[PDB]
Amino acid sequence: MTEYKLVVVGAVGVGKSALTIQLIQNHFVDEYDPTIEDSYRKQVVIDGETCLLDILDTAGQEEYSAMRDQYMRTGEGFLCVFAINNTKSFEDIHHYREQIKRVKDSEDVPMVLVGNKSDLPSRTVDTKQAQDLARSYGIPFIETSAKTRQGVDDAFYTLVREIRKHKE
Ligand SMILES: COc1ccc2[nH]cc(CN(C)C)c2c1
């Protein structure tokens, strides 16, 4: 069995744990908890292929800068989930992108753009502009609300598809 190695990163006020737990045990928590290092490993079926995903939830606080630059070339995919309600996290993505490219040492890298809190009428991040920004890198942008769970399953399939395309 192929063990997929990926991590979940994001800014403050995104609610990353809402999306992870939703797929892990189908549960949604409204409470906010700054998960520093929480393991979310589960058997996932991708295209009829049951595999083990080493999913880890990591917080992106400035308190851990050196620790965050310690190692990065040990992950296949970096789940960068932002919130459509947080315009800061949307613009911050550029910084994260630059960081990834710097360490990856390669431009050929499969990535996707998923946004959380799409169930909020308080939209700050425009989908049109997001599409343009995503198309600049060649990555797809999908709105994935954890509360109602809209297009989250399908989004995960596409995320892994690009990784498989990179494999072969
Ligand atoms: C770079 O740190 C990473 C990246 C991806 C990973 N997949 C699995 C692991 C290890 N696991 C114990 C979290 C991991 C670490």
Solving technique for this entry? NMR
146 CB neighbour count, 10 Å cutoff: 25
Containing 165, the helix (H) or strand (E) segment is: helix 152-167
- Going from the Cα of 74 to the center of ligand 1, the distance in angstroms, rounded, reads 6
Helix (H/G/I), strand (E/B), else coil: 127? helix
Q: Which amino acid is at 109?
A: V
Helix (H/G/I), strand (E/B), else coil: 68? coil
In this structure, what DSSP letter does residue 82 have?
E
Say yes or no: CB of residue 109 within 6 Å of ligand 1: no
Tell me how far apart the alpha carbons of residues 84 and 90 are, in angstroms, rounded to a whole number: 8
Tell me how far apart the alpha carbons of residues 10 and 89 are, in angstroms, rounded to a whole number: 8
- Which residues have C-beta within 8 Å of that of residue 31, sequence separation ≥ 6? none
Residue nearest to atom 7 of ligand 1 (CA): 5
Residue nearest to atom 4 of ligand 1 (CA): 75
Tell me how far apart the alpha carbons of residues 76 and 71 are, in angstroms, rounded to a whole number: 13
Sign of CA dihedral 48, 52, 58, 64: negative
Topology of domain 3-167, per CATH? Rossmann fold (3.40.50)
Tell me how far apart the alpha carbons of residues 60 and 88 are, in angstroms, rounded to a whole number: 13
- Going from the Cα of 92 to the center of ligand 1, the distance in angstroms, rounded, reads 22
